[PDB]
């Protein structure tokens, strides 16, 4: 996260951390269930074996609980070449257990959602990923509010395909932006004093860019595939 | 112009679908809907979508 704040206590708690064997960050993820992840897909050729934690505000420092993956449900088109479709459900061998700083982002049904979430000003992005494009990951999660961008101003900022599976975020020209490390992260909107999960970190070109936005997954395209992936 | 589910949501705390001409709320998973069919009320504790204070 370029620009934006600190998740002070309690205020970023859906928020989860994909972990290296160096115990390192390398991708978000968003707290669905006690026994599911949502990342991006484009998050599980970024590693090998990989762990996800929960309940980290100051990496630093010591909430937090380190689970072991059962399943990794990625979705079948997937493909770098386009970045469509770039979402993917983890399946924990152990429940996450909710606490201070450790819960669940509501899913939406769709039409509601994209009628009323999707229509709202803003999104709140989050992650340890970097504070501006060359630095290095951040020790503490934050935060930061994402204005929704039209489809329309977003195509013809982007050097790539904006497909209908993705939406755009953030700003045209404010250092305010998500970067490297928050991929597969969490998107939500709120309503009501309600946080609900909205898209996933998928990619940008480059990290608060002029003429440059972020690109995120668009989750109400897949909430049928979300609740497939958690029957099983 | 703006009826039902486009006049504040409906009047509903979450989910607003117009079903027969008339306002019907919902609740996300873990919550259930009050008596007055508006208001959500979660089952237990951690409910999603909320910030946590304890
Ligand atoms: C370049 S590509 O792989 O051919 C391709 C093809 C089709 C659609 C998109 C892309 C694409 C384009 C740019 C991509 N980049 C360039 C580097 C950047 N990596 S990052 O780790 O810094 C992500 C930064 C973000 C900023 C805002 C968001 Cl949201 S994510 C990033 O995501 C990328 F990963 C994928």
Same mark, same amino acid.
């Given at each position: ?5 600190? @998740? ?39 590693? !090998? ?49 909710f ?6 982002? @509501? ?84 309503? !009501? ?30 909430? !049928? ?8 | ?25 919902? @609740? ?11 208001? @959500?009320?979660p089952?237990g504790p951690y409910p999603?979508? !909320?910030?946590?204070?304890?």
């Amino acid at each position: 996260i370029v620009g934006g704040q600190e @998740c002070k206590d309690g205020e970023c708690p859906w928020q989860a951390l994909l972990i290296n064997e160096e115990n390192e960050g390398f991708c978000g993820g968003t707290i669905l269930s006690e026994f599911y992840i949502l990342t991006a897909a484009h998050c599980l050729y970024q590693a !090998k074996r990989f762990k996800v934690r929960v309940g980290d505000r100051n990496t630093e420092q010591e909430g937090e609980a380190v689970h072991e993956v059962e399943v990794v449900i990625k979705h079948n088109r997937f493909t770098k070449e386009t970045y469509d479709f770039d979402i993917a459900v983890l399946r924990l061998k152990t429940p996450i257990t909710f606490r201070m700083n450790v819960a669940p982002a @509501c899913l939406p049904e769709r039409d509601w959602a994209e009628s009323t979430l999707m229509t709202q000003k803003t999104g709140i992005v989050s992650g340890f990923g970097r504070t501006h494009e060359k630095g290095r990951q951040s020790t503490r999660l934050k935060m930061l509010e994402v204005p929704y961008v039209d489809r329309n101003s977003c195509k013809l900022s982007s050097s790539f395909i904006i497909t209908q599976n993705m939406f755009c975020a953030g700003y045209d020209t404010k250092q305010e932006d998500a970067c490297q490390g928050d991929s597969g992260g969490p998107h939500v909107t709120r309503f !009501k004093d309600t946080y609900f999960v909205t898209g996933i970190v998928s990619w940008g070109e480059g990290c608060a860019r002029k003429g440059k936005y972020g690109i995120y997954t668009k989750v109400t395209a897949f909430l !049928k595939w979300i609740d497939r992936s958690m029957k099983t | 112009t703006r009826k039902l589910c486009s006049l504040d949501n409906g009047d509903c705390d979450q989910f607003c679908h117009e079903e027969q001409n008339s306002v019907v709320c919902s @609740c996300a998973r873990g919550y259930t809907l009050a008596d007055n069919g508006k208001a @959500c009320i979660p089952t237990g504790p951690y409910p999603c979508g !909320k910030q946590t204070l304890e």
